[model samples]
Target chain A: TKPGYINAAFRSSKNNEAYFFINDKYVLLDYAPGSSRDKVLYGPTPVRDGFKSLNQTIFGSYGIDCSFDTENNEAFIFYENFCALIDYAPHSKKDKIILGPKKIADVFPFFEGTVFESGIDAAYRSTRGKEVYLFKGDQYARIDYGSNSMVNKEIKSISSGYPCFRNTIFESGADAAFASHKTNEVYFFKDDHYARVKVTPXXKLXIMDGVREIVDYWPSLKDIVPL
Target chain B: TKPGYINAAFRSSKNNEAYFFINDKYVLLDYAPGSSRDKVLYGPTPVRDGFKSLNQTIFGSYGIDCSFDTENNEAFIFYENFCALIDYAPHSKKDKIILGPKKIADVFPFFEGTVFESGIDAAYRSTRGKEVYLFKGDQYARIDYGSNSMVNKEIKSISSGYPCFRNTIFESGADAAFASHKTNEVYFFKDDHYARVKVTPXXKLXIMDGVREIVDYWPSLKDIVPL
Candidate 1:
């Protein structure tokens, strides 16, 4: 994921300095400024490690997806692909280590796409291609953040409405909500259960495309679906 | 390989209403037509199959470590990394057709930081961090383009006379090579092979760097490296 997407949430550390974000999963490897001014200026290392033992488990090919909870000095990583938690930041690579390679393929047989909105939050679409699942635990339980669990189903089924609410709260702040680079789009989890929103307004979400390129030859989507 | 390098040698084809350079190798795929009405336009599918065979022979990661032999109409792909070609192109999923996942990590582990030159016919270093390559592949034996040997010695040794044959070729061409946005002096590729030619009275290569940025990185080297 070298040239891929990243949320702006963890761009700054408690020192209020910009840091580099790596991994398509649960950990946030914050970059620290090294003493060498000319060379090795910044080094990137995973900063969160204690969130895994807290809750229910759901795992996907995307390893563990994460979201930063700005209001609570928390970094929420989706551990076990389902349960996520607010964990303490690790000071160095030796401080915490994540198990397994950070590829979603390890967890799922062939997961095509996944959206992680918060820690313990995300949706996984299996290799069978179309089973969109909102992660609950070992088994994906059905719940709708969009339709408000279909309770306020009349609101046009808004799932990532939290960003809208967040944007409304910090009205005069950065217009990250309407900015061209914003990544706060709602994604459908399974047919109707959980909807994963990867990022907030100023920060955003990642939409993993099932198949990399969708070829548009002769008007048939038959060529686009992954095996 | 998004933003891949494309090179072609122009020649007259037998079906000569329009001049056609012979382009052949593992595959050739169809593309949408251009503005011209009677043009039999097709996108060039570089040869990768042969290289895939080579990579397999070496028990290596299937990769795109091969180059093309336009004279022989073939492409050589790496073996173990043969899947890299699939990652590159993946044009036809059903048929397992690929185009190019032309990336540094995907193709250049075996051959790093060198531009595959067309003249010398070997992968050669460029003018530092640039796509331009010198001392490229040249036509020779071994059937596979890369198997051909390259010249590792100097073309001329400056011994005694000024009017010597090597000096003469160096006089006109060597001092005559310079590229311009602002005209620099003339130079040539005679004695040494930096290919720097002085276009002005003085001898040096006149290179215009900022001029390229103004045009949105256009005026590609295709115009300069054209055969």
Candidate 2:
């Protein structure tokens, strides 16, 4: 049975699987069309060492938010103040911290602490430039790994396309933000949540939104596992 | 129901309760005698703010090690490379990161990185001087807060009484190094997991050991829920 509620959830960039972090463990659900409940996978097991399990398990801190890059088979878990990276293709099982266990000042040395704490409200990689846009409270910061740039000094305000305070946001095809703010609203078109709803699964776009379609899409599998 | 595994656990210095971290959520068990099973408390609700919840929850990294100061009512959650502090009694709910989301070097500038990751295998405050002894692989480092010491330069090897490879260790009243080693042996003493085991429950301690008496006490509720 699925535990309590989903603490964090993400869809893999390299496959048709969705990962749900519940309690201190993570469960994976296969979203491939016509998949079954048997497709559920559990783990990123906290134990790595037989006797030295503490080290690995501790680092297995619950995942907060994740961003996947299909082109690179890369995944980023933004947990607390630390960030862990994983290659989800052949190495989907391995993850390690690339930046953090330090203050934003110590790690990025550019982004304001306030912005970093606001949680990576939303994050997405631009297909055109492969640049990463990490959205926070009222602004977004850019990270260009291609140019070896650190956290971009410039913090841009959130565009009209994303919700202001939702936890579930993803970067699909066209970058749209949807939310159940009182009446299930989409960012740019505030009054309606339907267009964004249909656009989500139909377009496969990626922007940060918390609305159901913007959040989860179970083609079959366990129909009631609304985790 | 109690969760099967404890990622990390700590007892409130100000109250008669112990907290267990399971998955990304927390479960509280009353340690006070006469307490009923209904006394179990669960939460911090996993979600703090929307984005804030993600950061905190994701960062709710499993607790690798912990140290508590009964006098100050401060609890520190040590994960792989990060640390967070929580105030448990009057406010058994607030938690925040003070020293990390960074490397041990970044957090305790003086400590060597190798030693820190070996697993803060066991950590406890010296009953005699209130110093903190963070035990790792083969050695233990002492931190003297009274002298305003950031990190002690002297690193002491584990006592011959303890196993070099055992991962879980704890300190109790007499500065005992307790462990629930593979053989289920309590440190220093072997074969008898019962004598010292009984002492853990009758007494209140926060050290790590396999002997029930040296571990924790839960009375009237879940007789052996020695989690």
Q: Considering every candidate listed, which one attains the maximal TM-score?
A: 2
lDDT of 2 by residue, A137-195 (tens): 55656676566354555665544333332333222112212122112212221111112
Give per-residue lDDT, candidate 2, residue A137.
52
Fnat of each prediction, in sequence: 0.00, 0.00
Candidate 1 lDDT at B153 equals 19
**Alpha-carbon TM-score of each model against the true structure:** 0.20, 0.38
> Residue A48 of model 2: what lDDT?
25
Candidate 1 CAPRI classification by DockQ? incorrect
The true-versus-predicted C-alpha distance at residue A208 of model 1, in Å, is 22
RMSD of 2: 19.5
